[PDB]
Design a protein around this ligand. Sequence first.
Ligand SMILES: [Mg+2]
Ligand SMILES: [Mg+2]
Length: 283
Amino acid sequence: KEGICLIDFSQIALSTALVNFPDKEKINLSMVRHLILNSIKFNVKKAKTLGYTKIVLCIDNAKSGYWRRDFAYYYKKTWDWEGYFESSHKVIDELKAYMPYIVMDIDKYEADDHIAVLVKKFSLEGHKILIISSDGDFTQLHKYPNVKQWSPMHKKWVKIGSAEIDCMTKILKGDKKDNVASVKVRSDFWFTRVEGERTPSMKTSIVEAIANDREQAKVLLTESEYNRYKENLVLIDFDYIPDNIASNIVNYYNSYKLPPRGKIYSYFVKAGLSKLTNSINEF
Ligand SMILES: [Mg+2]
Ligand SMILES: [Mg+2]
């Protein structure tokens, strides 16, 4: 059973670019092609050296929004961000055309989704898994056999009882960064809040009691809070990803045709990344 590496790509490329490309300076295609290929090399190396030889780049595609928006409208509702994303979108195309990786890219599907679903499938299928991402949410998947997670900036393992509590903490208190609100407030609180508005706190003993036995949601939460809980499950909990979303990801995965590995040399050449031709072995 081949070792598999799922990479939270879109974020890593972007995060690297935020750190490496100077503010108030234009970002060109070369810049980003260079940046992206080097990032892949560096991370593919980490993976392969450890035994995860099948690389899957998982992309964030909110071109037409998010499937989750069909459940919660408010969900997820100087630097050359323009030049970056333009060139980046182009480079992703080249990866699909020439590089030897499965590029999980689906409009309205998040990199989190592809990882959550693939990790599940493969883990249960007997493969050892590596998640390359600093996102603590992936600890929801450590519960599956042979799942490790590596954080590429600080270069370290994401290790985590505490997982169920971390998750439950988000289900109950929300996640402001994604516009997910506490079960103690109205659904679209973050999209519609007033400056004169604050979220009532959720006591830890409750969070923990539910984390430990979810049926406790029915006694510790008021009916209102409970409705909010069930809405938050789909926004936070990977196990609440719809059968249809899951199925499409797996299909995409299975129908993916990789390009002859002989195409890389040409690409590098053609794309003027000759310094890299000497390192195709590293891809
Ligand atoms: Mg993500
Ligand atoms: Mg999420």
